[PDB]
Enzyme design. Structure first.
Site, PDB file in Angstrom:
ATOM      1  N   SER A 131      -0.832  -9.752 -34.614  1.00 15.36           N
ATOM      2  CA  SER A 131       0.520 -10.509 -34.738  1.00 15.36           C
ATOM      3  C   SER A 131       0.857 -11.526 -33.936  1.00 15.36           C
ATOM      4  CB  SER A 131       1.581  -9.224 -35.075  1.00 15.36           C
ATOM      5  OG  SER A 131       2.497  -9.516 -36.042  1.00 15.36           O
ATOM      6  N   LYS A 141       3.244 -13.104 -42.188  1.00 13.55           N
ATOM      7  CA  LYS A 141       2.337 -13.828 -41.997  1.00 13.55           C
ATOM      8  C   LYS A 141       1.266 -13.941 -43.021  1.00 13.55           C
ATOM      9  CE  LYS A 141       2.566 -13.209 -36.846  1.00 13.55           C
ATOM     10  NZ  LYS A 141       3.711 -12.784 -36.902  1.00 13.55           N
ATOM     11  N   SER A 190       6.823 -10.011 -39.334  1.00 13.54           N
ATOM     12  CA  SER A 190       5.437 -10.271 -39.215  1.00 13.54           C
ATOM     13  C   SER A 190       4.687  -9.888 -40.920  1.00 13.54           C
ATOM     14  CB  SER A 190       4.941  -9.635 -38.431  1.00 13.54           C
ATOM     15  OG  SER A 190       5.273  -9.954 -36.964  1.00 13.54           O
ATOM     16  N   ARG A 242       4.883   3.768 -38.290  1.00 11.45           N
ATOM     17  CA  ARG A 242       4.780   3.057 -39.490  1.00 11.45           C
ATOM     18  C   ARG A 242       3.464   3.542 -40.428  1.00 11.45           C
ATOM     19  NH1 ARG A 242       5.098  -2.959 -36.714  1.00 11.45           N
ATOM     20  NH2 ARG A 242       3.754  -1.827 -35.399  1.00 11.45           N
TER      21      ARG A 242
HETATM   22  N1  TVZ Z   1       8.691  -5.063 -27.537  1.00 14.52           N
HETATM   23  C1  TVZ Z   1       8.631  -5.923 -28.683  1.00 14.52           C
HETATM   24  O1  TVZ Z   1       9.303  -6.937 -28.361  1.00 14.52           O
HETATM   25  C2  TVZ Z   1       7.414  -6.119 -29.268  1.00 14.52           C
HETATM   26  C3  TVZ Z   1       6.984  -7.008 -30.081  1.00 14.52           C
HETATM   27  C4  TVZ Z   1       5.718  -7.339 -30.964  1.00 14.52           C
HETATM   28  C5  TVZ Z   1       4.666  -6.059 -30.731  1.00 14.52           C
HETATM   29  C6  TVZ Z   1       3.524  -6.217 -31.376  1.00 14.52           C
HETATM   30  C7  TVZ Z   1       2.562  -6.951 -30.925  1.00 14.52           C
HETATM   31  C8  TVZ Z   1       1.043  -7.066 -31.502  1.00 14.52           C
HETATM   32  C9  TVZ Z   1       1.083  -6.306 -32.751  1.00 14.52           C
HETATM   33  C10 TVZ Z   1       2.072  -5.403 -33.236  1.00 14.52           C
HETATM   34  C11 TVZ Z   1       1.602  -4.432 -34.222  1.00 14.52           C
HETATM   35  O2  TVZ Z   1       2.828  -3.708 -34.720  1.00 14.52           O
HETATM   36  O3  TVZ Z   1       0.736  -4.639 -34.905  1.00 14.52           O
HETATM   37  C12 TVZ Z   1       3.121  -5.396 -32.558  1.00 14.52           C
HETATM   38  C13 TVZ Z   1       5.111  -5.087 -29.650  1.00 14.52           C
HETATM   39  C14 TVZ Z   1       6.280  -5.048 -29.212  1.00 14.52           C
END
Ligand code: TVZ
Length: 242
Positions: free
Chosen positions: A95, A50, A47, A227
């Site tokens: 994201s 993006k 991501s 992170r």
């Molecule tokens: N378990 C998963 O597949 C998963 C995938 C994407 C996210 C996610 C969604 C939105 C923002 C973020 C972020 O880090 O800023 C991370 C979480 C968990």
């Protein structure tokens, strides 16, 4: 110039983690890292892509401005915040992969490839599906290459309009207070081993800018908050932030 500061390794191991942090002091033109080799190790951007994807979509007119609404396609996905309408700001914030997959399809292979060559972005290889190569295709970028790319964006030197670069920098806004501003983007790569997390961006101070790029092993989603937490421990130790 690049200096290795192995005392920063403790910020990973003491969090029961492994990774690299890379910092660049813009005023002095000097870089720092805990691990010179991993700072140059190339991974899927996930991501963090993006950022360039937004720039290309804006400059080609795929996205008109930061208010244009991208309607939910009605498919219920496992990330609740994805199951709603978004604009560029909120799509970045949460994201929202499916919004950006639609961006990529409208951009198309040829234009996407040309733009990443113009950006000098990573290995410039978009092999894979035009709408998922940054998640399971051939594109790779290292932490130091992320800094190179971000420095161009900060200075409006990428081969897109100034307007496009300003809008993406607005959409990257993550934190601001009386002491600093952070513009950044997270990443989470899960489709191909090794699973890793990214955080890349910069810290604006009154009289300097510190660019940063970090990645870390991410065997479970439970550590995603590390992170930002690990990065901020480095920034605090170096007195970049309080
Ligand atoms: N378990 C998963 O597949 C998963 C995938 C994407 C996210 C996610 C969604 C939105 C923002 C973020 C972020 O880090 O800023 C991370 C979480 C968990």
């Amino acid at each position: 110039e690049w200096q290795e500061n192995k005392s920063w390794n403790a910020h990973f191991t003491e969090h029961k983690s492994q990774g690299v942090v890379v910092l660049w002091n813009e005023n002095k033109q000097q870089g720092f890292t805990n691990n010179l080799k991993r700072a140059n190790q190339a991974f899927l951007p996930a991501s963090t892509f993006k950022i360039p994807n937004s720039l290309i979509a804006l400059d080609l007119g795929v996205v008109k401005d930061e208010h244009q609404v991208f309607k939910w396609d009605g498919q219920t996905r496992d990330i609740a915040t994805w199951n709603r309408d978004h604009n560029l700001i909120t799509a970045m914030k949460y994201s929202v992969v499916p919004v950006y997959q639609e961006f990529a399809r409208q951009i198309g292979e040829a234009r996407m490839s040309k733009m990443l060559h113009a950006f000098d972005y990573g290995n410039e290889d978009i092999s894979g599906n035009v709408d998922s190569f940054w998640l399971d295709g051939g594109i790779r970028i290292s932490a130091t290459e992320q800094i190179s790319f971000l420095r161009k964006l900060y200075h409006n030197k990428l081969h897109v309009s100034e307007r496009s670069q300003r809008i993406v920098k607005q959409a990257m806004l993550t934190e601001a207070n009386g002491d600093y501003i952070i513009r950044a983007k997270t990443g989470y790569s899960t489709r191909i081993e090794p699973k890793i997390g990214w955080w890349v961006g910069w810290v604006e101070l009154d009289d300097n800018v510190w660019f940063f790029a970090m990645n870390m092993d991410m065997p479970t989603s439970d550590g995603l908050g590390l992170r930002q937490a690990i990065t901020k421990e480095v920034l605090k130790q170096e007195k970049i932030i309080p």
